Amino acid sequence: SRRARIERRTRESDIVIELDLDGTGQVAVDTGVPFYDHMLTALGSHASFDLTVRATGDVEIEAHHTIEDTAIALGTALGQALGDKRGIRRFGDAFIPMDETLAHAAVDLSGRPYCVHTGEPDHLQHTTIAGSSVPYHTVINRHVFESLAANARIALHVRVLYGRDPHHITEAQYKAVARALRQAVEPDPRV
């Protein structure tokens, strides 16, 4: 009903997105960038989407291109699956506490494409989250939310009220966008 399959094949990467807005958190994400996988799994789960994301890109250079193309593809999927947007809440927002962190997101689904990202501590502009694989530079967080908003054609405002740990600060934001989405996407029993 509200589903979309998006294939995005660029020089730098290969993306397949399968999205059902009216899901139960059946989410599977593999991008070659494990922390990104973790963030997108949280987003799909907490938005109660069913979501598959398969992506392979030029991670030898760094995660940037793959992360960006994936977000673009995902935003495109979101718009398509939304369709005419009639009968929905339209607006949604959510606060996410995560230990010391508090993040917030608000959305207007029928609003024009726009992203405002504020409150993220300055050290996240040069912070790396690294494991045994391809690392994630948190400076990309903004890029993701902008790409997503621009291709879903929605208004997305993401705020960090405060926080210290970069993992918490980032996950809380992704989760906040997710629940904001979940709320806004739901059928509105009055309109």
Q: Which residues are at the interface with a copy of itself (CB under 8 A)?
A: 24-25, 34-35, 37-38, 48, 58-64, 72, 91, 93-100, 102, 106-108, 111-114, 116, 118, 123, 125-135, 137, 139-140, 142-143, 146-147, 150, 155-157, 159, 161-162, 164-167, 179, 190-191
User: Which range, of 16-24, 49-57, 70-78, 170-178, touches Mn ion by CB under 5 A?
Assistant: 170-178
Q: What is the dihedral of CA 171, 44, 142, 138, to 10 degrees?
A: 40
Up-side HSE of residue 19: CA atoms within 13 Å toward CB?
28
Binding site partner of 149, from a copy of itself, Mn ion, ligand IYP, none, Cβ cut-off 5-8 A by kind: none
| Binding flags for Mn ion, 26-65, as an x/- string (CB under 5 A) | ----------------------------------------
In the complex, minimum distance from the CB of residue 111 to ligand IYP, in angstroms, rounded to a whole number:
6
Instruction: State which residue, 3 or 91, has the beta carbon closest to ligand IYP.
Output: 91
84 binds, among ligand IYP, Mn ion, a copy of itself, none (CB under 5 to 8 A by kind): none
* Least distance in angstroms from the C-beta of 79 to a copy of itself: 13
The answer to whether 36 and 137 have CB atoms below 8 angstroms apart is no
- What's the chain's length in residues? 191
Q: How far is the CB of 104 from a copy of itself (least distance, A)?
A: 8
What is the enclosing helix (H) or strand (E) of 20? strand 13-20
Any long-range contacts for 4-9 (C-beta under 8 Å, 24+ apart)? 4/76, 4/77, 4/78, 4/80, 4/81, 5/77, 6/73, 6/74, 6/76, 6/77, 6/80, 8/69, 8/72, 8/73, 8/76
Which one-letter amino acid corresponds to residue 3? Answer: R
CA distances from 190 to 81, 87, 180, 183, 187 (A): 21, 8, 19, 15, 9
Report, in Å, the least distance between residue 92 CB and ligand IYP.
15
Q: How far is the CB of 7 from a copy of itself (least distance, A)?
A: 19
Q: Which residues bind ligand IYP (CB under 6 A)?
A: 64-65, 68, 110, 167-168, 171
